[PDB]
Amino acid sequence: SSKYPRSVRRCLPLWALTLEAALILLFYFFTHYDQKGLVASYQVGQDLTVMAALGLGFLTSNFRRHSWSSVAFNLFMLALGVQWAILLDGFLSQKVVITLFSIRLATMSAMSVLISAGAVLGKVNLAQLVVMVLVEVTALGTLRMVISNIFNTDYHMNLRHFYVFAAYFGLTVAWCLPKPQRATIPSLSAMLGALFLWMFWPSVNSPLLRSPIQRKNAMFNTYYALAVSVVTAISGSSLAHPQRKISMTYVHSAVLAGGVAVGTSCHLIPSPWLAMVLGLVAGLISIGGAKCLPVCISVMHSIFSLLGLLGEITYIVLLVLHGFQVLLSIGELSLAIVIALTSGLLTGLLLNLKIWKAPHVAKYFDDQVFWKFPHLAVGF
Amino acid sequence: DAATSFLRAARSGNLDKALDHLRNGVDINTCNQNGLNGLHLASKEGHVKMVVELLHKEIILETTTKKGNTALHIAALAGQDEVVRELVNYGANVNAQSQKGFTPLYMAAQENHLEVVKFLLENGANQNVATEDGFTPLAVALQQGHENVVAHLINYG
Amino acid sequence: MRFTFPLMAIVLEIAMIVLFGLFVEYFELYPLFQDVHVMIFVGFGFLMTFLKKYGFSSVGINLLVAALGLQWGTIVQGILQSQGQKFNIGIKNMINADFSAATVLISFGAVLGKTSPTQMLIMTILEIVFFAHNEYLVSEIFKASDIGASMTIHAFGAYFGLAVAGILYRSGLRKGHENEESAYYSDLFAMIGTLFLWMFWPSFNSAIAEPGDKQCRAIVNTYFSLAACVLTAFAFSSLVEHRGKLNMVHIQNATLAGGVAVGTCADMAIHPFGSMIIGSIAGMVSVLGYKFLTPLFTTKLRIHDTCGVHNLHGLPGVVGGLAGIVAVAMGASNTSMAMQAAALGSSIGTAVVGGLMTGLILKLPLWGQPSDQNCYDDSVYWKVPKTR
Amino acid sequence: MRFTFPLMAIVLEIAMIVLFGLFVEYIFFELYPLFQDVHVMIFVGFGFLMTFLKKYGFSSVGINLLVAALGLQWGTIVQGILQSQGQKFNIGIKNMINADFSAATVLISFGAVLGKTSPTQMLIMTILEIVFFAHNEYLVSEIFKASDIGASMTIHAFGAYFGLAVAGILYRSGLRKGHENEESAYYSDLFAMIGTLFLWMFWPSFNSAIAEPGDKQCRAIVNTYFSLAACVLTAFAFSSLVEHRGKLNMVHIQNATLAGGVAVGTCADMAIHPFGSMIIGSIAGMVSVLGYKFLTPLFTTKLRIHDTCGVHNLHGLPGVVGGLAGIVAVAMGASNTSMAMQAAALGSSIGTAVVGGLMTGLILKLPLWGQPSDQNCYDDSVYWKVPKTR
Ligand SMILES: CC(C)CCC[C@@H](C)[C@H]1CC[C@H]2[C@@H]3CC=C4C[C@@H](O)CC[C@]4(C)[C@H]3CC[C@]12C
Ligand SMILES: CC(C)CCC[C@@H](C)[C@H]1CC[C@H]2[C@@H]3CC=C4C[C@@H](O)CC[C@]4(C)[C@H]3CC[C@]12C
Incomplete structure (x- = not known):
């Protein structure tokens, strides 16, 4: 068919304006507003916002000709996802009361979509990303509600499964897409994004913790695990590379290894040495994943999926120390994986519809598909 | 409406319907509101069988749209290499x-x-x-x- | 003369030191101050780096202008608040000095690529004087509510810059310029400033908000206004462009118009849905301004605005003032109607008059202004590397 | 050889884990935002400041990340052991801030040898320099009892002169007259401006993180703020003065604008007044620019000390100016503590930095760490996969 992109001058504006108008109407009909630590509480959600817009936004900007779309589409996805997550977390956990804590939780839900979208970025347009944002936020909320109903946990505390849900959802959606690179300056911008993610990830591991000592220990464990993981990743990149050089792309993903590994168990680890051991093991598994997974589409999302599974497994191991609960937690993990896979499949078949005017497979990873450039022939 | 149906058959690749329309008396050089005739739409959508059949029916090859684009321009912009080869084989500038x-x-x-x-x-x-x-x-x-x-x-x- | 700029910089710094010695004496708002700081120096400076051959001047003159501006604004605002007496310096003084720097940077966006660093020092001094006087008039004489400063910072800075750029009009640049064009990595770098401004704007509108309900309201309203603004700016950028392509100018600037237009009503009880309405209208207005009013201003009114600050700061700032007036109409605030209207009018008028006088001073051929062919070029004032 | 770097790192990490298990156990949230700003300064400011080299951006930012990540752990261990006198200790926010300070010292030293070393060499430098720095700052804070809250002597002067000693030991004859890879590019300079701006913005948190809460912390924040503001003006003015045809130099704008933050460090919490902080910032910027124009060319060619980032002009000379400013402030009566103890802190910082840098550079001079050749200096391709497209 025609490899020249179809005009979205009527699809994209109508779709986005309708979405925003519906969000405004729902906020009018259902949302309602309402001290000493106002700034302290605002700081955590602000850290999550920096990690979503800047960290994940630039982490996927490493593409040679897709940095514009990565950054701007991540911004758009965050803006849509926070509003929709506010409404949906209101609907599935009760009028919707808007606090800074609810905005923080909506930001976490949006970050799930932002992590998933790295597996599909460069192969989709903005409308498909809108569909992905909506369906993925809905699926994560449904998963949390199902867990809260079955295992009698809090709906908000079920958001700890977000690493593995995002990883497997993105893997499934990328698997459903039609089948098909770096530059120095985009790689440096991606290093900026990765550094911001790595620096603020202790805020990802303790937004849902109320007790101050729990948050303290979680941030301590995340900080030390992330330090050990950075060292292990940068050093072992040479082993897991055919030409024995350090890979910037591998580093960008593998710095977050310890943070992901201790994410679900940071508040439970009692001493920094155990967090450092977990960070080292996560770095070694990241090296092995880089060396092995391409043999058996995105390798970084595959190793992130492995790391999230490892984090849940080490949570299972550590929770026993602090056998029915083992079965219950294995069941929670398997339900999370099953729902992530099924919802990713549904999203993938939705994204394959002709109405979205997806880019031709020859036109992947290219900003000219979506953006204005000068001195180009336009139209027919 | 016959010209519109012929142009839609050109755009969709329905060669049989368009040939029936041409047999019924539809003009070969009719074009849409943008100036794209049947050869332009066939080149856009990569329908080589349509391009060959239109060229055989004495369509004008070097006709332009309002943007000034010939069928070769449209085939080159759309990336239809087989349509490009057919057009050049039939003498496209x-x-x-x-x-x-x-x-x-x-x-x-x-x-x-x-x-x-x-x-x-x-x-x-x-x-x-x-x-x-x-x-x-x-x-x-x-x-x-x-x-x-x-x-x-x-x-x- | 090549020694005009170092002479003026040294003399201005010595004057700043003397004024601090004469007038100045010696923690919950420090994180918000640092957010505003990042907005001032990383946000605007890298936001203006879209020009392919003016990135050095953009970020560096941003740093220089804002560094002079915080000192001079500290002195002027403190003298106004103390009526010529000695005053102490807290976190609020630093925040307000950063706000004065923001106003000067907004005006800088209008004249970017056509002015010298010396002209920028002069404009910084004069503009901060005018801005601080108008802001004192709004805050203490009118006593209007402008906690996010849609009127006193954004509208003022935009129309000050527009007046200066109108006085500094060059006939040779009306049809365009070969250096006035973006590059790929330049727009990638501009996205950094865009994203930092978007991320930290809730602290911009809530830093000096009254603690309690007003500060939380400012944070939440700014956040949801920006959330709606992003979607509407993307939608209208696609709407106004051929085949629905996105324009990086729009995505870089119009995505931030919600923060500007919600500033007056930030701490007001306008509800999150009202904040999202304001943000959507701001994004639409900003995109329409970029697409249609900037060519009209450049070609017909002879007002060239390099960064389109009229579309990000001027029109959304006016929209924010009108939103404040309307919110006063429907009981969202206890401030008077006439005082909000007078604040808007005084901000715009003072900006225009001060910009006229400042631009008339900047038009003297003593500051090393670039030639028409040398506009939007770093090499006039910088040593430029051989490769990109 | 092929496995030296990963093996050294895995052995160092296992040693870190064992030491943490043997010695480390678990006001925090009030000081956490300042620590976050210091963390951004360490990993984004310093890392991107050194990305001005056109073919060394990957190694600059990545080795900055590796060195600082190892440095926080090793500095935690060493500083805690020194404070606790060999006993088990609990870590708080102060421990993280001090560990990031130690990493900052190592990164300052790294700025001198950027482009001429291997990652293995930087692992060894981090390990040795943290020991030397922690012992010196323990001597300054606990035996001398000097006041250096912004660490003009213990971090900046120490790190700069340690790096200068290492660079002098690691001197290359073939690099005396320059190198084709030792030059900047446009977008590399914009990334360097990212690093510069983050350092400049967050320096008040750097200078006030350990300050006593109340008047001292606020004084440190205000003094750093206005000192940096004055420093920018004087750096721009003297960059225009010293260059040909008055053109600004991105090296000066990237580095000399932080000299005010470097120099106000010793006097940060002292009551010097904001105007006094501005005078120190204005001199710091002047001295930094003049150092970059005149001192660095002399040090490289006459003294055989090549310093890649000019860390002597940003951390070395302004650090000594800050220590001297602190001595004048005690004489003025702005501060407690004696004149002799401030002078002893300055002298001990310089001497310990030089001696430790000499021994560290002698260890690094061994042909076992895969250091690059003269032809391959300032090139990412020695250690990284570099994309074909810029
Ligand atoms: C701030 C803006 C929005 C409103 C006010 C701007 C007015 C006062 C400014 C901007 C446009 C300006 C004019 C634009 C063009 C010219 C032609 C020039 O050869 C002489 C000055 C002259 C005639 C300017 C005079 C001042 C002017 C009228
Ligand atoms: C741009 C110019 C025309 C200003 C008009 C902007 C309009 C769309 C804005 C500005 C002021 C806003 C109102 C301010 C206060 C209130 C009361 C509150 O309980 C519900 C929202 C509501 C009703 C807002 C709705 C939207 C609003 C009317």
Whole structure:
């Protein structure tokens, strides 16, 4: 068919304006507003916002000709996802009361979509990303509600499964897409994004913790695990590379290894040495994943999926120390994986519809598909 | 309405319906609101059987739209290499210029259509014809980072 | 003369030191201050780096202008608040000095690529004087509510810059310029400033908000206004462009118009849905301004605005003032109607008059202004590397 | 050889884990935002400041990340052991801030040898320099009892002169007259401006993180703020003065604008007044620019000390100016503590930095760490996969 992109001058504006108008109407009909630590509480959600817009936004900007779309589409996805997550977390956990804590939780839900979208970025347009944002936020909320109903946990505390849900959802959606690179300056911008993610990830591991000592220990464990993981990743990149050089792309993903590994168990680890051991093991598994997974589409999302599974497994191991609960937690993990896979499949078949005017497979990873450039022939 | 149905059959690839319409008396040179006749839409959607059948029925080959684009321009911009080959085999001017001065080679280079660029260069396309803005296929390929197009343009010379 | 700029910089710094010695004496708002700081120096400076051959001047003159501006604004605002007496310096003084720097940077966006660093020092001094006087008039004489400063910072800075750029009009640049064009990595770098401004704007509108309900309201309203603004700016950028392509100018600037237009009503009880309405209208207005009013201003009114600050700061700032007036109409605030209207009018008028006088001073051929062919070029004032 | 770097790192990490298990156990949230700003300064400011080299951006930012990540752990261990006198200790926010300070010292030293060392060499430098720095700052804070809250002597002067000693030991004859890879590019300079701006913005948190809460912390924040503001003006003015045809130099704008933050460090919490902080910032910027124009060319060619980032002009000379400013402030009566103890802190910082840098550079001079050749200096491709496209 025609490899020249179809005009979205009527699809994209109508779709986005309708979405925003519906969000405004729902906020009018259902949302309602309402001290000493106002700034302290605002700081955590602000850290999550920096990690979503800047960290994940630039982490996927490493593409040679897709940095514009990565950054701007991540911004758009965050803006849509926070509003929709506010409404949906209101609907599935009760009028919707808007606090800074609810905005923080909506930001976490949006970050799930932002992590998933790295597996599909460069192969989709903005409308498909809108569909992905909506369906993925809905699926994560449904998963949390199902867990809260079955295992009698809090709906908000079920958001700890977000690493593995995002990883497997993105893997499934990328698997459903039609089948098909770096530059120095985009790689440096991606290093900026990765550094911001790595620096603020202790805020990802303790937004849902109320007790101050729990948050303290979680941030301590995340900080030390992330330090050990950075060292292990940068050093072992040479082993897991055919030409024995350090890979910037591998580093960008593998710095977050310890943070992901201790994410679900940071508040439970009692001493920094155990967090450092977990960070080292996560770095070694990241090296092995880089060396092995391409043999058996995105390798970084595959190793992130492995790391999230490892984090849940080490949570299972550590929770026993602090056998029915083992079965219950294995069941929670398997339900999370099953729902992530099924919802990713549904999203993938939705994204394959002709109405979205997806880019031709020859036109992947290219900003000219979506953006204005000068001195180009336009139209027919 | 017969012309509209014929143009829709051209756009969709329904060669049998369009041939029936032509037998019924539909003009061969009718065009839509944008100036795209049946050959233009067939070249856009890559329907070589339609392109061949329209050329056999004495369609004008060097007709332009309001933008000044021939069927070769549209086939080059759309990346339909087999339609490009058919059009050139039937005598398409490879060096035709639009209203803004684009050539089929420029359109293929701006859209990273490497094999179209290859065929046009092998068929005598002049990579020195600049646009109104002064841009060459080489310049637009450099701007868009179409490195293989740049490499083949400098290698052919 | 090549020694005019170092002479003026040294003399201005010595004057700043003397004024601090004469007038100045010696923690919950420090994180918000640092957010505003990042907005001032990383946000605007890298936001203006879209020009392919003016990135050095953009970020560096941003740093220089804002560094002079915080000192001079500290002195002027403190003298106004103390009526010529000695005053102490807290976190609020630093925040307000950063706000004065923001106003000067907004005006800088209008004249970017056509002015010298010396002209920028002069404009910084004069503009901060005018801005601080108008802001004192709004805050203490009118006593209007402008906690996010849609009127006193954004509208003022935009129309001050527009007046200066109108006085500094060059006939040779009306049809365009070969250096006035963006590059790919330049727009990638501009996205950094865009994203930092978007991320930290809730602290911009809530830093000096009254603690309690007003500060939380400012944070939440700014956040949801920006959330709606992003979607509407993307939608209208696609709407106004051929085949629905996105324009990086729009995505870089119009995505931030919600923060500007919600500033007056930030701490007001306008509800999150009202904040999203304001943000959507701001994004639409900013995109329409970029698409249609900037060519009209450049070609017909002879007002060239390099960064389109009229579309990000001027029109959304006016929209924010009108939103404040309307919110006063429907009981969202206890401030008077006439005082909000007078604040808007005084901000715009003072900006225009001060910009006229400042631009008339900047038009003297003593500051090393670039030639028409040398506009939007770093090499006039910088040593430029051989490769990109 | 092929496995030296990963093996050394895995052995160092296992040693870190064992030491943490043997010695480390678990006001925090009030000081956490300042620590976050210091963390951004360490990993984004310093890392991107050194990305001005056109073919060394990957190694600059990545080795900055590796060195600082190892440095926080090793500095935690060493500083805690020194404070607790060999006993088990609990870590708080102060421990993280001090560990990031130690990493900052190592990164300052790294700025001198950027482009001429291997990652293995930087692992060894981090390990040795943290020991030397922690012992010196323990001597300054606990035996001398000097006041250096912004660490003009213990971090900046120490790190700069340690790096200068290492660079002098690691001197290359073939690099005396320059190198084709030792030059900047446009977008590399914009990334360097990212690093510069983050350092400049967050320096008040750097200078006030350990300050006593109340008047001292606020004084440190205000003094750093206005000192940096004055420093920018004087750096721009003297960059215009010293260059040909008055053109600004991105090296000066990237580095000399932080000299005010470097120099106000010793006097940060002292009551010097905001105007006094501005005078120190104005001199710091002047001295930094003049150092970059005149001192660095002399040090490289006459003294055989090549310093890649000019860390002597940003951390070395302004650090000594800050220590001297602190001595004048005690004489003025702005501060407690004696004149002799401030002078002893300055002298001990310089001497310990030089001696430790000499021994560290002698260890690094061994042909076992895969250091690059003269032809391959300032090139990422020695250690990284570099994309074909810029
Ligand atoms: C701030 C803006 C929005 C409103 C006020 C701007 C007015 C006062 C400014 C901007 C446009 C300006 C004019 C634009 C063009 C010219 C032609 C020039 O050869 C002489 C000055 C002259 C005639 C300017 C005079 C001042 C002017 C009228
Ligand atoms: C741009 C110019 C025309 C200003 C008009 C902007 C309009 C769309 C804005 C500005 C002021 C806003 C109102 C301010 C206060 C209130 C009361 C509150 O309980 C519900 C929202 C509501 C009703 C807002 C709705 C939207 C609003 C009317």
